Structure formats: structure tokens, C-alpha cells
């Protein structure tokens, strides 16, 4: 027997689905969403790590001259300075007094720990959602792992389920991502090959294991002081370190809807938004024949108390008349109220009690026990406490019933004024028609 329904994407919400097949006793299903996971698709763009600049020992060809030659190193710098008269620990060599030359070189390379301490830049799109849900009915428990798109069906004890695509298409990960350790940032990194000194991406590599490197740190060399051998340079500090110092914020503490970011792989877990459609298919062994189910006639509903709190705060009593004692499947045919349980024991005494939760001052809903029916209407009072640590178990509707006290007063006042207006119109039209008849 094919069936379909819709359930909210809120962790811990005790969704109950009610299936009524005309030839068999009604059945009630309990479903919950134990865990979710919104995993995006990643295209690694490049990697960054702190740089390390290497300075080869200066070559002083003295009483002679040298020539500078180019090489292929990232950000290579080399120069020749004339007129050097160096000194050493014993005494100044290069005895040819003033015709000397020093050749300085410098070039940059990735740090030693670039494979242990680095930041990645990604482009993210097309999220895929995964879920883990609990199903109960009849006498079968069990939680199962499901892909949420209309392309995975999992069988639970003879029943087949399919979870349709998410109603909304909201994803917290922006178009461009920067990942470090276990933190995700909505940053806009500069493209490959166009970094700037002193900021993020001053050196860039395609991957951690690659050979090439593109570095741009404005490395400059200065003529050495007289009587020294020290090859001075100047260079703006590592961009990665200052990005570390002033990255600013994160996503783990800024994502909406209260969903936790993690890493390895990047994902957003338990992230409350939207609705999940469910398409079912059931075998004939799941139901029960009418003949063995109890018969319930003359169903009446009363409400003991109501209290629109987060926990189940209303007690409801049902009176009936039955022939034999057994089991029935309670349900509420509206979302204004949510019952706690999905089964009840019916006995010859004739009275049963249930717990429900609401969020409106005056609810009015129809409750069914096995195949019977009844209407329940009640008045509710506010809760006195201010803060609680467990989430809402009602579906959060506040518009009252049309028979509620507030709408009763509105209706009475509107009726009085409308009747007065109709009387006015009748008087004026009567006078006009009397004027015409003459």
C-alpha cells in the first residue's frame, strides 16, 4: 500500500505518521531524525604555508671580478657589490686592497613543516545531504542510515522507505572556503598566481606534494657595511602568520540555524531547516484484520488541564464502550496538538488517558482511537517558568480556535455592529421606497 507524507527536519522531533487503509485497522508510525550531515563538494584550489628564506654563503672574488647569473628559483635575487674589504677573525684577507667583489644571492622556499601546518583554499558547491533516522511501529525498533535525495530506498522489516529531496536549498558554506585544522572560513582568497606580499597567499603551491611554488615577498638585498661579510636583506613578514593573527571570526561560531561545522571532511551537522518528504510502501503483513482489532463506539473527549509549555503539558481523557480488551493506535489529525504516544491499551473499563503538547491558548483538534473519532477543545494557561534547557516539542502554531474566548468576543462585537448597520440600511431604504411609491 503506497503512502506519502512530510516531516520536519528538526532533530529529536517525535514525528508520527498515521496510515488508514480502509480494509484494515489504522496504523501509526513513529519516526525521528537522530542525525544529519550536509556535505559540500570541494575543488582544491591551492595550499599555503609559512615561508623560509635561505641565504647561501656570500662569494667574495677578491683581486678580481665576478658576474651575476640568473637561475630558476621562486623570487630569486642576486647582485654584485664592489669595493669590499672584508675582515676575519685573524686579519683582513683579500690583500688586493680595493679591487674586490661580493656576489650575494637569496631565494625563498616552503617551510619544513608545510605538510604538517598549512591552510587550504577550496571552491564549494552542490551540497549533498545525508541522514540517520529511527523508525518504530508494531513491534520493530531500529535506526538506519539514508541518503536524502530521491535515489536511496532502505527496507526496514518488510517496509520500503524513500526520502525525497530537501524542500529548501540553503547551504551555509559560501562559494569560497579556507580550511585550517578544524575551522572553516567564508573568505575570498586571491586567485592563483596573483598573491600580494604581507597578506594571505604570499606563497602558493598547487598541492602539498607538488614541486613548483609561486612566492612574492618583495625580497631586497642591501650593500654590506664596510669591513663585514653578512649579506643584508629586507623582506616583509610571512603572510600566513599575519593571517593567523588577524583572520577574524570563524564559521563554527557564526553559522545560522545552530548547526555545527566540522572538518575532515568539511560538513555541517544537525542543521535545522526545511521539510523532508517521505514516500513509503508497505506489505500486507504489517497491518491487522478488522476482525481481531477491538471495536470502539461512543467516543467522547474531555480535557483535564492544559499548559502550553515545551514539555507535554496537557492531559486528555477518552471515554468509550468496547466489547473486548486489546490495543489501539491513537492519533491527532492536526498539528495544533502533538500526542506523546502512538499506541494505547483499551480495556472494558471504558476510560483511557493520554498526554499532549500544544502552543496555542485554545486548541481544537480531532483525535482518533483505532477507527473511532472525537473532537477535543480546551482552554490553556501560560507556563510560569522563564527558561528551560530542552527544545520545543510542539509544532509552534498560535492562532486560536474560532470558538475561543478571544474570537468569541470579537464575533459578538462584530455581530452587534453588523446588525446595527443592517438596521440602518433597512430604515433608509424603507424611507426611500415610501417616497417613491407616492
Amino acid at each position: 500500500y503506497e503512502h506519502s507524507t512530510v516531516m520536519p527536519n528538526v532533530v529529536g522531533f517525535p514525528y508520527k505518521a498515521h496510515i488508514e487503509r480502509p480494509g484494515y485497522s489504522p496504523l501509526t508510525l513513529q519516526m525521528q531524525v537522530v542525525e544529519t550531515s550536509l556535505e559540500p563538494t570541494l575543488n582544491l584550489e591551492y595550499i599555503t604555508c609559512e615561508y623560509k628564506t635561505v641565504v647561501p654563503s656570500p662569494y667574495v672574488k677578491c683581486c678580481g671580478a665576478s658576474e651575476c647569473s640568473t637561475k630558476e628559483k621562486p623570487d630569486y635575487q642576486c647582485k654584485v657589490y664592489t669595493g669590499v674589504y672584508p675582515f676575519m677573525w685573524g686579519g683582513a684577507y683579500c690583500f688586493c686592497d680595493s679591487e674586490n667583489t661580493q656576489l650575494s644571492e637569496a631565494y625563498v622556499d616552503r617551510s619544513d613543516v608545510c605538510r604538517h601546518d598549512h591552510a587550504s583554499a577550496y571552491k564549494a558547491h552542490t551540497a549533498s545531504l545525508k541522514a540517520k533516522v529511527r523508525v518504530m511501529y508494531g513491534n520493530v525498533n531500529q535506526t538506519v542510515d539514508v541518503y536524502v535525495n530521491g535515489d536511496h530506498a532502505v527496507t526496514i522489516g518488510g517496509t520500503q522507505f524513500i526520502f525525497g529531496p530537501l524542500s529548501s536549498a540553503w547551504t551555509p558554506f559560501d562559494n569560497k572556503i579556507v580550511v585550517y585544522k578544524d575551522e572553516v572560513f567564508n573568505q575570498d582568497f586571491p586567485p592563483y598566481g596573483s598573491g600580494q606580499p604581507g597578506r594571505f597567499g604570499d606563497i602558493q603551491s598547487r598541492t602539498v606534494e607538488s614541486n613548483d611554488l609561486y612566492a612574492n615577498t618583495a625580497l631586497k638585498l642591501a650593500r654590506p657595511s664596510p669591513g663585514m661579510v653578512h649579506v643584508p636583506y629586507t623582506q616583509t613578514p610571512s603572510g600566513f602568520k599575519y593571517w593567523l593573527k588577524e583572520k577574524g571570526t570563524a564559521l563554527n561560531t557564526k553559522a545560522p540555524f545552530g548547526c555545527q561545522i566540522k572538518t575532515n571532511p568539511v560538513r555541517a551537522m544537525n542543521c535545522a531547516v526545511g521539510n523532508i518528504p517521505v514516500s513509503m510502501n508497505l506489505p500486507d503483513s504489517a497491518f491487522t484484520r478488522i476482525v481481531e482489532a477491538p471495536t470502539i463506539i461512543d467516543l467522547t473527549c474531555t480535557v483535564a488541564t492544559c499548559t502550553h509549555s515545551s514539555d507535554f503539558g496537557g492531559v486528555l481523557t477518552l471515554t468509550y464502550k468496547t466489547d473486548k480488551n486489546g490495543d489501539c493506535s491513537v492519533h491527532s489529525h492536526s498539528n495544533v496538538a502533538t500526542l506523546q504516544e502512538a499506541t494505547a491499551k483499551v480495556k472494558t473499563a471504558g476510560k483511557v488517558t493520554l498526554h499532549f503538547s500544544t502552543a496555542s491558548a485554545s486548541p481544537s483538534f480531532v483525535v482518533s482511537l483505532c477507527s473511532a473519532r472525537a473532537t477535543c477543545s480546551a482552554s490553556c494557561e501560560p507556563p510560569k517558568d522563564h527558561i528551560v534547557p530542552y527544545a520545543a516539542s510542539h509544532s509552534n502554531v498560535v492562532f486560536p480556535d474560532m470558538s475561543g474566548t478571544a474570537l468569541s468576543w470579537v464575533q459578538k462585537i462584530s455581530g452587534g455592529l453588523g446588525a446595527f448597520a443592517i438596521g440602518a440600511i433597512l430604515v433608509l431604504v424603507v424611507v426611500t421606497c415610501i417616497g417613491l411609491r407616492r
Partner: protein, 52 residues
């Protein structure tokens, strides 16, 4: 506020309807020195209570 404005608009309109009806029903009698017809004089509150 919306409900209050609707109520006031309705009540003022209906009162205006009664006023216009009384003017229409009483202005012909204000052009002839005739009887006020005690039967309608008591029913509808006109300017002359008992003065003709």
C-alpha cells in the same frame, strides 16, 4: 488599531445613514404648515415636539 478603526468607521457610517433618512422623511413636512401626525411625531424625534 485596525479593529478599532473598522468599528468606528462602521458606526459612524450607520449613524450618518439614520441622519440622512430622517432628513429625507422630514423635509417635505417642513414646506407646508400642516399637522405633524402625532402617531409619527412620537415615533420620530422632530424639531417641533408639540408645536404643530
Amino acid at each position: 488599531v485596525g479593529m478599532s478603526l473598522l468599528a468606528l468607521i462602521s458606526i459612524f457610517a450607520s449613524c450618518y445613514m439614520l441622519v440622512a433618512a430622517r432628513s429625507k422623511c422630514l423635509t417635505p413636512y417642513a414646506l407646508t404648515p400642516g399637522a405633524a401626525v402625532p402617531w409619527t411625531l412620537g415615533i420620530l424625534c422632530c424639531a417641533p415636539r408639540a408645536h404643530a
